[PDB]
Each structure stands twice: as structure tokens, then as C-alpha cells.
Amino acid sequence: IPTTENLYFQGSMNIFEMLRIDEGLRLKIYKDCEGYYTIGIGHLLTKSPDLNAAKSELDKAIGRNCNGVITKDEAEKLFNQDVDAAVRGILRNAKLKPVYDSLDAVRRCAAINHVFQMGVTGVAGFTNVLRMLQQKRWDEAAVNLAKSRWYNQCPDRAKRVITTFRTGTWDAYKNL
């Protein structure tokens, strides 16, 4: 039986808190689970293996000479930009928008997270999952997401998103 505090937990969760858990917060350039240079809250800098390219992309993104290091405030600004880009990417896309529109608020967060992680064309290519989601076939959608390279190459970053598509609750983000 949910306590008063437990019923408040959903109001504390949103897309920013969700991606902050899945992506972490790092103030120095590091390589993600796929070996790509990343910083902040999941900001993929480049897919190039050249750190100099990553640092160049960073300085461009932040607007100063960072030498591979940013502040928390800078990470947060970049994060908000990246979240806005994922939302805009869904809403302008004729395949993703109707699916997103059909979803409840919590699954819409899972959808934005999914696009933040994979990009629009990657997600829009999941033909069967998108149909399943639109048809509210949640268990099937989650099983099919669990077959993807996105999840299987880096399970810890994707597992909670998959659970969230299955349940439409925030339970996978509780008790870190």
C-alpha cells in the first residue's frame, strides 16, 4: 500500500530526472558503454575515436575553451537542449508523432528517453515496437525492445526505459 510519500514520488519524476538516472552526470569527457566520447548527462560528443574531435565538439557546444571539463550548470544547460531536441525530433516526425500522442505521460517520457539515446531514425525503424505501443501491447513491446542492439550492447542504460514502456509507472527509478 503506497504511503503518502510514495504517492508523491511520481510528482518528483519527469524526463529530466529519468534521463539523469539512466545517463549519470559526468563533468569530464568519458567514453560511454559503446566507446563514444560523452560528457554531462549523456551528451554524445562525436562518434569519432579521436579525443581532439570530442574536445572540439565540446568547446563548440559550450562556447568556451573547456579542455574537456564543464560545470554542473553547463551540463544542465546542454542536457535541457538535448531533451528539447529529442522532443522536437519526435513531434516533427510523421511516424513517431502519432505513437507518442497515443501514449500516457509516463510512457511519453520513455519515448523521449528512447529518442535521446538512439536518435530519431533509429527509433522510427523499430516498426513492430511502434505498432505494439500504439496498440497498447505493452508486454510485447517490452520483449521486442529487449531484442534490440540498443538494449543488448548496453543493458544498464536501457533497462529502466524498457520496464517503463511495459508498466507506464516510475517503479524502475525507485530505490536506486
Interatomic CA distance for residues 153 and 43, integer angstroms: 18
Q: How many of the other CB atoms lie within 10 Å of CB of 114?
A: 26
Structural domain span for residue 86: 1-176
Backbone angles phi, psi at 136, to 5 degrees: 60, 30
For residue 39 the three cell numbers come to: 560528457
CB proximity list for 42: less than 8 A, separation 6 or greater: 19, 22, 23, 24, 32, 79, 82, 116, 117
Helices in the chain by DSSP H: which ranges? 4-12, 15-23, 51-62, 72-91, 96-102, 105-118, 120-124, 127-134, 138-145, 149-153, 155-167
Would you list the DSSP string of 91-140?
HT-TTHHHHHHHS-HHHHHHHHHHHHHH-HHHHHT-HHHHHHHHTT-HHH
CA-to-CA dists, residue 126 to 3, 71, 148, angstroms: 38, 36, 9
Specify the DSSP element, H or E, that contains 28: strand 26-31
Identify whether the C-beta of residue 133 lies closer than 8 Å to the C-beta of residue 102.
yes
Number of domains within the chain: 1
User: Please, are residues 159 and 151 in contact by the beta-carbon 8 Å criterion?
Assistant: yes
Coil, helix or strand for 50?
coil
Catalytic residues: 23, 32
CA atoms of 126 and 141, how far apart (whole Å): 10
Give the three cell numbers for residue 47. Answer: 562518434
Distance (Å, whole) CA 70 – CA 29: 9
Specify the experimental method: X-ray
Task: Count CB neighbours of 38 within 10 A.
Answer: 21
Distance CA 36, CA 163 (A): 25
Q: Return the CA Rg of the chain.
A: 17
- List the CATH number of the domain containing 128: 1.10.530.40
Closest CA to 19 of 35, 38, 45, 41: 41
Cα distance between residue 167 and residue 107, in whole Å: 8
> What DSSP designation does 158 have?
H
Q: How far is CA 72 from the centre of its chain?
A: 19
Angle at 52 between CA 47 and CA 54, to 5 degrees: 40
Residues composing the chain: 176
CA pair distance 10, 171, nearest whole angstrom? 9
Residue 63 burial (CB count, 10 A): 8
